[PDB]
Ligand binder design. Structure first.
Ligand SMILES: *[C@@H]1O[C@H](CO)[C@@H](O)[C@H](O)[C@H]1NC(C)=O
Ligand SMILES: *[C@@H]1O[C@H](CO)[C@@H](O)[C@H](O)[C@H]1NC(C)=O
Ligand SMILES: *[C@@H]1O[C@H](CO)[C@@H](O)[C@H](O)[C@H]1NC(C)=O
Ligand SMILES: *[C@@H]1O[C@H](CO)[C@@H](O)[C@H](O)[C@H]1NC(C)=O
Ligand SMILES: *[C@@H]1O[C@H](CO)[C@@H](O)[C@H](O)[C@H]1NC(C)=O
Ligand SMILES: *[C@H]1O[C@H](CO)[C@@H](O)[C@H](O)[C@H]1NC(C)=O
Ligand SMILES: [Zn+2]
Ligand SMILES: [Zn+2]
Lengths: 482, 482
């Protein structure tokens, strides 16, 4: 009878963890048995040596994750949708260097502070205040002793990846300062119109290859420029995303496409943000099928709170309009402060999803409210480790939320800046590190289905997506089972 | 109405966090205002610079914590009782060096592998297999060219404290190896009878000075020895603890005293532990007023599970007797394994308190069960940081438990090994790091009161303890408010 009490507590936990109540068919039971055999063996070996990739910094863990048989299976898994991604962090940086900086008219410069920047131009742009002289990359490479090393030095400027990140990034402000500097550096490359088109297309190629069929992207929609010196506007960029995504779907018929969440930086004044909000409303009118809504991005600890922006964020409501929100909220180690209260405020503003919600488990009333309104968190484990929110992912606060089956989706945020690609590395971190040893095929299946459920697609489009994914899921299962 | 919802959610979180329903009188309201003002000021500054002691390693944080005005108030607070302590980690190591190692008849020696060892003896003992030459400290001392340097060498060998603990202790097995080696090395100093008596007395002096009035100690009851080489038994050490505590209470009449939880090491075979369990039952008959029960200690990740010991641990029930248990359980980063299942098994064995329960928040059925049977966890935050379970204490899993007011007590475990003293450093980590910015005077008062409630004292003794504590509390409140 105590023996029965113990059995009951274990079964209750089995049923309440994420995916616990899902029914597997006989072929799925076999796939589960095989995947769990490999997962348990990897875990046993990690317990012996303490070489456990989720407990190490991703920069040093990556090469080990790539050798994991569990990682190999996760790679093959149709993961559904990537719902939390930013515009310029979703394409492997190698291609920016090896392909893009080798294109005609590419110039490089270094600021007074010494920050690398790029510009496509003809003729050579004239010295400005941010650039003493621009140098044609073709000319520069004629003058360097070892081109291979020069190119690699460019690649090092384009990602946070480093040996000894504990020495290099001593605190969260330093890592954010480096992060932001990267966006500044690569921006002149990506926002040149022919590169912009090629970039958007390649990001779809990379996710498709990783068995991801739908992307929603937080996009700043900064001006895209031509050689002629002309700059385009926000509407042009949204049209271009739609056009490139339509082109990709033509040759990739199971790919669903992309939607855009227009975003602006949370360092900005409330009047400026009010203008972004009006722009968001207008963009929703012009492209109801492409623009999902609005979000505020940037370093959450040091920028403005959602409360600070109350008057701007209430505009759509004061005008009788629904503007969907996807707020980044609670991406912080602090508790009981104005920063983690952003989660409550995002919910009061009827957010559709919460970006990160890392602080959520410390707020049990907010957690309940979120659970009751079925508003998921978007969890990006690698991002949280790299930007120093938690050191060992076995301590990630989402573990507690996985154990009670809270609504969530997994995504990768800015994988290219961390040396990741698509969604698979992030799925490995959740499946192996955050969900513990008893996370199983039902966990994975639930996370994949959730990413379809919590997308902003029409219900009729979700049904179609679900049908496409179920067939991909069946082929995956067959492969793993045999 | 949306404004009202927001207010309700915050009020609910206010009422359900630990201590949230406690009613403060007007003098306590004033004390809380002053304490929270200083706490908010310290946190605001930490947020500006990111120099935040709970987020840093305690070895590097301590000098800043000692400068904190909040720490100064906590040192003054009557904290009630220390309920999770080990026998040889509770006296500042400085005294073991400056005082004990200068006592007549103290020898030092080195094992074949080079591990330092001590023995008090007269005359000098013969060379043995574990020691090839015992050398008197007085002899050894003049031979060195700087005796102040040799002394400091000893002090550095008696604690884990170091610069660059990330470099020195690269994993949990390494820190545990050094940890246990310290216990081996100091053991010969402390188990000589006159020192053993003096050690126990000084441990009470240190906690008393820190405004702690009662202690329960996990004690291995290792043989205590005389100059002649004679060894005493378990019964003798229990009688000695009772006698020394009685002596202390005689001149410190507000001090409640001590009790002993007999413990044995979890690396041992099940039959050997069955012998310890019979010993525990016998000690309980002989000393029902002094011996509270039994616990299993040692590195939990690498030793036997409670399940493995089921046969031994059921002996009292099979013999018709209640042996109270106080199990260390779930002191681990792993999840879904046999290690974190120790919490469930502790509870199935009717444990009175859980040591650590670090993994508890990841087990919601187990968490509910322990809440329903009112079984508390004993939280030792500095221990968990130093032994590498979590790097930033803002991420400590007990934060989630504090937010729902889960039953718990704070203790210090082995403060001497970490460079701590008494209970105040652990109370600072809980109040500033784990409980967040909103933890307040009610948080502190509840935890102090909890440590009386969850002690093993008779209800009539808890009543008397509460009366003594309340007088010290009122004086503390008057000081802080003025
Ligand atoms: C970035 O590139 C510059 C130019 O070659 C080089 O000086 C520097 O080492 C690179 N930065 C990093 C962090 O590798
Ligand atoms: C660069 O990439 C584009 C497609 O984005 C394509 O024109 C070409 O294959 C690449 N160039 C080279 C030299 O590989
Ligand atoms: C959220 O929904 C409520 C109920 O319809 C409404 O009163 C409020 O205006 C909405 N808020 C926003 C910011 O859209
Ligand atoms: C104490 O000295 C030993 C043996 O020389 C050394 O290896 C060990 O790391 C030291 N332990 C400490 C400083 O805790
Ligand atoms: C715990 O209590 C139950 C029910 O009274 C009893 O059956 C069991 O033997 C007890 N276990 C121990 C270890 O005392
Ligand atoms: C240290 O040892 C005891 C305390 O246990 C004390 O009575 C004695 O005075 C001290 N010895 C010295 C040399 O200060
Ligand atoms: Zn993001
Ligand atoms: Zn302990």
């Amino acid at each position: 009878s105590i023996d029965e009490t113990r059995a009951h507590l274990l079964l209750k936990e089995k049923m309440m963890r994420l995916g616990g109540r899902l029914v597997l068919n006989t072929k799925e039971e076999l796939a589960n048995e095989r995947l769990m055999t490999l997962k348990i063996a990897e875990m046993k070996e990690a317990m012996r040596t303490l070489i456990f990739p989720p407990s190490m910094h991703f920069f040093q863990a990556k090469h080990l994750i790539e050798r994991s048989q569990v990682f190999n299976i996760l790679r093959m898994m149709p993961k559904g949708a990537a719902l939390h991604l930013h515009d310029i962090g979703i394409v492997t940086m190698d291609w920016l260097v090896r392909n893009v900086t080798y294109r005609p008219h590419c110039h490089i410069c270094f600021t007074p502070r010494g920050i690398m920047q790029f510009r496509f131009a003809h003729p050579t742009p004239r010295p400005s205040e941010k650039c003493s002289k621009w140098i044609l990359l073709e000319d520069y490479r004629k003058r360097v002793q070892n081109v291979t090393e020069f190119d690699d030095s460019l690649l090092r400027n384009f990602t946070l990846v480093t040996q000894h990140p504990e020495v290099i990034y001593t605190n969260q402000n330093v890592v954010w300062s480096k992060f932001e500097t990267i966006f500044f550096t690569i921006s002149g490359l990506i926002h040149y119109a022919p590169v912009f088109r090629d970039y958007v297309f390649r990001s779809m190629q990379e996710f498709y290859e990783d068995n991801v069929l739908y992307m929603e992207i937080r996009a700043r929609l900064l001006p895209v420029y031509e050689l002629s010196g002309e700059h385009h506007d926000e509407e042009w960029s949204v049209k271009t995303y739609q056009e490139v995504a339509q082109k990709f779907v033509e040759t990739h018929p199971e790919f669903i496409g992309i939607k855009i969440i227009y975003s602006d930086h949370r360092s900005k004044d409330v009047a400026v943000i009010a203008e972004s909000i009006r722009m968001a409303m207008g963009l929703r009118i012009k492209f109801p099928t492409v623009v999902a809504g609005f979000d505020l991005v940037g370093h959450e600890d040091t920028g403005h709170s959602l409360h600070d922006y109350k008057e701007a964020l209430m505009i759509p409501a004061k005008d009788g309009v629904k503007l969907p929100y996807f707020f980044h909220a609670g991406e912080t180690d602090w508790q009981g402060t104005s920063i983690d209260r952003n989660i409550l405020d995002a919910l009061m503003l009827n957010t559709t999803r919460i970006g990160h919600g890392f602080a959520l488990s410390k707020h049990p009333a907010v957690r309940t409210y979120s659970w009751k309104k079925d508003i998921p968190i978007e969890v990006c484990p690698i991002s949280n480790q790299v930007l120093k929110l938690v050191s060992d992912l076995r301590n990630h606060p989402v573990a507690t939320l996985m154990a009670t089956g809270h609504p969530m989706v997994i995504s990768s945020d800015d994988p290219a800046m961390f040396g990741a690609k698509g969604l698979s590395y992030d799925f490995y971190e959740v499946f192996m590190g955050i969900g513990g040893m008893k996370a199983d095929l039902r966990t994975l299946k639930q996370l994949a289905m959730n990413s379809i459920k919590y997308s902003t697609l029409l219900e009729s489009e979700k049904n179609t997506f679900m049908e496409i994914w179920k067939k991909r899921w069946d082929k995956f299962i067959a492969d793993v089972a045999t």
